[PDB]
Design a protein around this ligand. Structure first.
Ligand SMILES: *[C@@H]1O[C@H](CO)[C@@H](O[C@@H]2O[C@H](CO)[C@@H](O[C@@H]3O[C@H](CO[C@H]4O[C@H](CO)[C@@H](O)[C@H](O[C@H]5O[C@H](CO)[C@@H](O)[C@H](O)[C@@H]5O)[C@@H]4O)[C@@H](O)[C@H](O)[C@@H]3O)[C@H](O)[C@H]2NC(C)=O)[C@H](O)[C@H]1NC(C)=O
Ligand SMILES: C/C1=C\C[C@@H](O)/C(C)=C/CC(C)(C)/C=C/C1
Ligand SMILES: [Ca+2]
Ligand SMILES: [Cl-]
Ligand SMILES: [Cl-]
Ligand SMILES: [Cl-]
Ligand SMILES: [Cl-]
Ligand SMILES: [Cl-]
Length: 340
């Protein structure tokens, strides 16, 4: 109950790199997706070690220049999304009509160490696929959040018109995909927080789709039916508010209802009643030790369930978004004894 919570560094990547999201395997290893300098999945093996091994799993260059989100489907299979991008610059826009979803399959004896990788589907009509979450009652299907520029172009980007946010379903067996929820301002940005996205990370808990909005300070949830469509009247509900640029989040540890969410150079815990507490980073004595957290997930081994593993993409606290020093990293926060 002492804040900030204990934390440690697991690994830094090189200058220019960007770790964007995380899925924890049933065996406890971390799988992290990178946006720059290439779109790859890396594995941190046995992350509870002081100095865990960090190994490239797969570079998805055949189909994409960058990965964004990752999410587990059926056990030890994962969907990643990505696209081509005009450059490796931190401010680069994506190339319109180049988004894709791909699979890493670690299931079965043949794949448990080196996975089988495939293209699931092209998404040329999407804008920017972002976060991935499987339907818990039908895990071969995922929802995928989608929002960024309507007209992304080579630098200098001048028309910053944002596309309205939306949420896809993707059937990873057949490749079929369609938009299941759209046209709500809880999905959108008006650049109240500067250039950014609207809907960003997603998770599904019970029959609720949860997301964070990077522009309006709100964490939202939406009652959904068995195919991901909203139950009428289809109105998002604000779960928590904090004037910070959210990115992604998780529930836990174990079965607990607490939300653990990345914000602006800081990590937050949010109670189901909306009480938000800054637990690490800026606004604690951590100061700027963890610039640009991007996502977070709890350990899955029986001896690290209370450890929150945090991905990030900056090497220093940036002056503004036009002077970002990218550097990918993963840290571990020990949440033991935190409670509301
Ligand atoms: C990866 O990128 C990082 C940048 O994000 C590179 O680190 C920079 O490297 C350059 C070149 O070596 C350094 O530039 C020199 O800075 C000298 C002094 O700079 C002081 O003032 C800075 C003002 O903000 C300050 O950030 C910096 O603090 C750093 O050093 C302290 C010890 O001296 C340390 O206690 C701090 O924690 C921090 O690490 C200095 O106090 C200046 O005299 C020179 O003329 C020259 O300009 C930058 O300072 C480095 N910046 C940082 C943040 O480390 C790094 O080299 C890149 N790696 C590779 C492999 O290229
Ligand atoms: C990596 C950067 C910012 C952090 C990132 O989360 C945001 C806000 C991206 C939006 C964009 C591309 C305009 C800014 C790029 C500099
Ligand atoms: Ca994100
Ligand atoms: Cl490889
Ligand atoms: Cl639009
Ligand atoms: Cl249901
Ligand atoms: Cl609230
Ligand atoms: Cl606080």
């Amino acid at each position: 109950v002492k804040l900030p919570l204990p934390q440690r560094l697991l690994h830094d990547w090189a200058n220019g790199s960007w770790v964007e999201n995380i899925s924890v395997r049933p065996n406890g290893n971390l799988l992290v997706s990178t946006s720059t300098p290439d779109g790859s999945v890396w594995q941190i093996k046995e992350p509870w070690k002081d100095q865990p091994e960090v190994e490239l799993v797969y570079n998805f260059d055949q189909w994409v220049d960058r990965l964004i989100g990752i999410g587990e489907t059926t056990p030890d299979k994962y969907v990643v999304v990505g696209s081509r991008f005009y450059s490796t610059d931190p401010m680069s826009s994506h190339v319109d009509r180049t988004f894709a979803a791909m699979e890493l399959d670690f299931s079965g004896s043949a794949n448990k160490d080196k996975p089988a990788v495939r293209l699931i589907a092209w998404f040329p009509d999407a804008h920017l696929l972002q976060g991935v979450a499987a339907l818990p009652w039908d895990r071969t299907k995922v929802l995928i959040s989608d929002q960024y520029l309507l007209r992304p172009r080579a630098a200098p980007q001048k028309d910053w018109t944002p596309a309205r946010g939306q949420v896809w379903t993707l059937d990873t067996v057949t490749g079929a995909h369609e938009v299941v929820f759209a046209n709500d301002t809880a999905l959108d940005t008006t650049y109240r927080h500067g250039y950014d996205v609207g809907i960003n990370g997603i998770k599904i808990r019970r029959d609720w789709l949860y997301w964070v909005n990077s522009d309006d300070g709100n964490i939202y949830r939406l009652k959904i039916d068995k195919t991901g469509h909203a139950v009428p009247p289809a109105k998002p509900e604000v779960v928590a508010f904090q004037d910070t640029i959210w990115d992604d989040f998780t529930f836990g540890p174990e079965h607990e209802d607490t939300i653990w969410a990345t914000g602006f150079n800081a990590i937050f815990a949010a109670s189901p009643q909306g009480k938000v507490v800054t637990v690490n980073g800026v606004g604690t004595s951590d100061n700027g030790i963890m610039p640009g957290p991007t996502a977070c997930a709890f350990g899955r081994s029986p001896h690290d369930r209370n450890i929150l593993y945090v991905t990030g993409n900056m090497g220093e606290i940036p002056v503004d978004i036009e002077h970002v020093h990218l550097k990918g990293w993963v840290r571990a926060i020990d949440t033991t004894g935190f409670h509301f």
